[PDB]
């Protein structure tokens, strides 16, 4: 074998996108982290997937959790381990100790195990092996140097054998040593760290491939998720810039608006409506989500500010009946507090819900409601993920941004998502004769020509009624205009 | 190598031996040391640093979920 | 000799600039870093380039 | 000198100033620091200098480096310790352990060593002594209390012997303990600390004297660089404010300006030219450097924004041929990325180049270039340097500063260097009728009278042209003025009809 390194795929959604193929075969990969990070789960999902997708039987070596329990649990992702053991496809090699015993049995057993293990491998023609918390073993009474030699013996034996392993390790500090005895680190070929980062009373699991001897991979931490369908990672960087782009057009829900953008919204595009609280974005959305129903197309509305019932209210008050849209199963509403999760969990609920309703349109009411509390970068990373997924999937996107300062605003968006979007529809308050009058404007349309005027516009039980511009005013943008009333030429 | 059961001083004299002999032979060498904190000591035992005539440090700084590789000639 | 030290070129793209010539001849150089920084590589690349560019065989202790 | 302690001169550049004379005679100075901090140079150089300038034979004790190596390395700077060891002016005493050793030997060897050192000094009649890395000695198997006692002994025997020693030491953390065992700090008479602060990927070395039992000295960290000449410290705080001041005048390369300047810049003055990007500070400097050459003087240009090549294209397009300027051996251009070194370094490169050429005029294009990323307190401290040097050297200076915001800048400099400079020439854009026009202003001159007018100026192939002010304009500094007219049409040369000629004849 005189070729590059060969990698086996884990099938763990996203792990292989980052490990450029996955764990290198015949070698041991180290996946350590703190208590509650997925390690165990990972190893399992490793074997399982291997069995159910390539009939590669597997050996699972547990030094603490009991077989009955490793199974009991797995049923949490809808996995009947018991069966794979009946089918001789998975062998749970119990290595835990019993409530009674002796001592002074250091490496005495590290030599028997390697024999009980090679046993199950050969015997079950195993290709994948996962050793859970190898740490809990020398957690009998050992020091660094002692551990280094035992591991090296193990891995070595396993590399001789030819099995591809994954070793579970426990850490105590999220950013401190890689493994409890800062020794494993160098005893392994590959290293994967699972982190459960606090930061704000909110946690955020992130996975990282520190190293892959002999092959390349992706650097840095990647957010992931532990669900009923196991560990789901999102290589928000992996995503390529190869999204389909068509000239097809779509209605905005507002004829005059469609006219302004010169023919409408491109089917393949991201639309951003920015306005100081009260300018009626949530209106445009409602309207934009109704039009994808009169055309019997499916559409989801992700509101993060208002309730299910309230939306219905304010909706029926503008005409549009959302009651129907529900029944006709063409419109599906979500609603969730940004505080009921993290941007990682959210992005998934979105993506996920998209796949089960196959939307042709999607509206997220208040992106900035989602930027509540979270860091800037983390947020962008969130938009790129939703914005993107929506892009390469042919789903027209309309997201709502509520700037932090009514009147005067010197920038479309505070988070600077500007460049991340195709068409910018900007609403703004204008102070005329001591009254707070609205105005709408197509700031930028990438493909189309769109109108350049800043048009007045009111709201009634009929919805948005766009009017004329303020042709005879100065500094509109600022919010507090100044009528010109020029003495013509004065004859 | 000294991850058998050693302590600083025993590690110091031992490097010194190695390096030294290799100096006699007239060999231009490159030694590899493993660390535990991107900005902590320069090497596992806090001895190696001073012992060597030339030192090079390769780091993989984390920071903001991205890692950046840097190389420093101490 | 009886002058400043002389260096060996590493051909490791750039590094031979950051050291004003390369590793000093007849001496060791400690290259360290945490797991994954690229030491083993750097050590290999030093050897390889040695051979491949001046026919200066090398020894690799592992 | 009023100091109860008689000091000895190191001759290391500026250390003496910092130590108010140099090491105390008959005592020991702990020079400690991490790895690659300068320890061994300092020590070596300390003996060397005593040998070359005072014929004070010296003993050098090494515990790790080999006697062959201390010589080999020492050539790096240009010293032949070999020869000195030959004339018996420098005895190197080897105490490194062997490549084929044993274990145990650090107490009766400390006694044997003292007895050894006494010998060498007695035999060579030495007055200076170094001891490199005593630390590595107890680095066999010891603890705090055993070191203190073993140090004390050595130091005490040394002082009885009457020797002016220097001990080097290692530390782990740049800012934590002073030494390793945390006991060297209190058994030494003096403690000199060397640091190599990382901070933002670059590396800055400083030298600090924590204590001198018995005298005053300069408190705090001071920058220094290691070069082909050894250590070199800059007493950026010892630099007294007693620079010479004359009333002589020197052109600015541009006449009108000169007028505006009461009659041409002061020979002894720091000149500051601020303005938005594109205002033409660069231009002005070019003329200022040129003019010195047109009059047969030497002047250097340090450019941190433009290549030496481009600096010439633009310089020619503005007339003035810099090529010749390089040839006639009057103008010397530098060029250096500010990211290609720290401030301590750039400061010295400049100084050096200022010596090997004796300019009469100096012009640093874009100090705000050097301000990139550095901490203001570190930058302000750089400015003070270059500036100071130039003042106490009778070398006129023309510094450049580019403001982060074009039009609307409410401050001369974003680094508030304002008060360091003596004269300020301002440049800015003026939105006059859908057009960006340049305006030049002489904001302040310390010794002269200077015009208080914000003249408009246009840039051409010939260069700078200084017209007149926008008298009929309010909110000029706003960048985008407002035009109020109580007149305009007023005289100046009314008389209508056919006032001109055309290309044919007049
Ligand atoms: N069905 C599920 N839905 C959502 N989250 C789940 C589900 N099952 C488990 N989890 C989460 O995944 C984690 C399980 O981690 P697991 O026990 O597999 O290994 P570990 O945390 O890496 O190591 P350790 O053995 O110390 O716990 C739990 O902490 C829990 O929050
Ligand atoms: N029936 C109605 N008749 C007239 N105007 C209405 C009616 N309903 C709502 N409005 C107007 O629309 C506004 C409601 O805002 P909307 O739901 O459109 O979202 P928004 O202004 O973009 O964002 P947010 O609701 O978070 O402030 C009210 O402030 C009001 O001026
Ligand atoms: N072909 C490749 N392309 C891109 N990156 C690679 C390639 N091969 C290896 N790498 C990267 O280099 C790392 C390999 O580390 P390397 O073997 O150079 O030594 P080191 O980390 O300093 O020592 P050690 O890994 O033995 O603890 C991998 O972790 C990976 O990120
Ligand atoms: N000619 C030179 N020009 C510029 N820098 C030099 C020159 N020679 C040596 N250096 C620098 O000076 C340093 C030498 O340090 P030195 O030998 O004086 O003692 P140390 O680092 O304090 O202690 P140790 O001997 O244990 O390393 C090196 O870090 C190197 O970069
Ligand atoms: N030959 C020329 N003719 C007319 N105008 C010129 C000529 N050369 C340069 N200019 C003008 O001068 C400007 C160049 O700026 P200059 O090199 O003088 O330095 P600066 O504006 O102070 O600083 P920087 O170049 O770093 O922005 C141009 O933007 C342009 O308007
Ligand atoms: Mg576990
Ligand atoms: Mg490693
Ligand atoms: Mg290695
Ligand atoms: Mg050192
Ligand atoms: Mg030294
Ligand atoms: Mg310039």
Curated annotation (Swiss-Prot), chain A:
Cofactor note: Binds 2 Mg(2+) ions per subunit, one in each domain. Mg(2+) is required for hexamerization and phosphatase activity.
Signals that turn on the gene: Transcribed in a circadian rhythm with maximal expression at 12 hours and minimal expression 12 hours later; expressed as a kaiB-kaiC opperon, this gene does not have its own promoter. Autorepresses expression. Negatively regulated by labA. Non-phosphorylatable kaiC mutants still down-regulate the kaiBC operon.
Effect of residue 101 to A: Extends the period of the circadian rhythm to 27 hours
Span list, region B-loop, required to bind KaiB and SasA: 102-109
Effect listed in the UniProt record for changing residue 39 to A: Induces an arrhythmic phenotype, significantly reduced ATP-binding
Cofactors named for this entry: Mg(2+)
Assembly mode: Homohexamer resembling 2 stacked donuts with a central pore nearly blocked on one side; hexamerization is dependent on ATP-binding. Binds 12 ATP; 6 between each subunit in both layers. KaiB only binds to phospho-Ser-431 KaiC (not doubly phosphorylated KaiC). Complex formation between KaiB and KaiC is regulated by the phosphorylation state of KaiC and by an ATP hydrolysis-driven conformation change in the CI ring of KaiC; complex formation is slow. Slow complex formation is crucial for the timing of the circadian period.
Protein name: Circadian clock oscillator protein KaiC
């Amino acid at each position: 074998e005189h070729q590059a390194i060969a990698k086996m795929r884990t099938m763990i959604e996203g792990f292989d996108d980052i490990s450029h193929g996955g764990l290198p075969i015949g070698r041991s990969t180290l996946v350590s982290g703190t208590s509650g990070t997925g390690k165990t789960l990972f190893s399992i999902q490793f074997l399982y997937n291997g069995i159910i997708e390539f009939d590669e039987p597997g050996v699972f070596v547990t030094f603490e959790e009991t077989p009955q329990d490793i199974i009991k649990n797995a049923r949490s992702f809808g996995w009947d381990l018991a069966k794979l053991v009946d089918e001789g496809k998975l062998f749970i090699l119990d290595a835990s100790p019993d409530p009674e015993g002796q001592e002074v049995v250091g490496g005495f057993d590290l030599s028997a195990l390697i024999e009980r293990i090679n046993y199950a491998i050969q015997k079950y023609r195993a290709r994948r092996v996962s050793i859970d918390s190898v740490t809990s073993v020398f957690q009998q009474y050992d020091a660094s140097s002692v551990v280094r030699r035992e591991l090296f013996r193990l891995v070595a034996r396993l590399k001789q054998i030819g099995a591809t392993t994954v070793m579970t390790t426990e850490r105590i500090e999220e950013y401190g040593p890689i493994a409890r005895y800062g020794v494993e680190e160098f005893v392994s070929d590959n290293v994967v760290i699972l982190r459960n980062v606090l930061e704000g009373e909110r946690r955020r699991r992130t996975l990282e491939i520190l190293k892959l001897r002999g092959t390349s991979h992706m650097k840095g931490e990647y957010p992931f998720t532990i669900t009923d369908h196991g560990i789901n990672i999102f290589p928000l960087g992996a995503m390529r810039l190869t999204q389909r782009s068509s000239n097809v057009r779509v209605s905005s829900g507002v004829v005059r608006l469609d006219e302004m953008c010169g023919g409408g919204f491109f089917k393949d595009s991201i639309i951003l409506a920015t306005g100081a609280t009260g300018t009626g974005k949530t209106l445009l959305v409602s309207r934009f989500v109704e039009n994808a129903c009169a055309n019997k197309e499916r559409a989801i509305l992700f509101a993060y500010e208002e309730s299910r019932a309230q939306l219905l209210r304010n909706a029926y008050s503008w005409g549009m009946d959302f009651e129907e849209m529900e029944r006709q199963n063409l419109l599906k509403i979500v609603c969730a507090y940004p505080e009921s999760a993290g941007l990682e969990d959210h992005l998934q609920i979105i993506k996920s819900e998209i796949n089960d309703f196959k939307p042709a349109r999607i509206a997220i009411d208040s992106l900035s409601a989602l930027a509540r509390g979270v860091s800037n970068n983390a947020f962008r990373q969130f938009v790129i993920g939703v914005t993107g997924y929506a892009k390469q999937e042919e789903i027209t996107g309309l997201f709502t941004n509520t700037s932090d300062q009514f009147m005067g605003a010197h920038s479309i968006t505070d988070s600077h998502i500007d460049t991340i979007t195709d068409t910018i529809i900007l609403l703004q308050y204008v102070e005329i004769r001591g009254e707070m009058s609205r105005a709408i404007n197509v700031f930028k349309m990438r493909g189309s020509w769109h109108d350049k005027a800043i048009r007045e516009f009111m709201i009634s039980d009929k919805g948005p009624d766009i009017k004329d511009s303020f042709r005879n005013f100065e500094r509109i943008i600022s919010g507090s205009p100044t009528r010109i009333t020029v003495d013509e030429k004065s004859e």
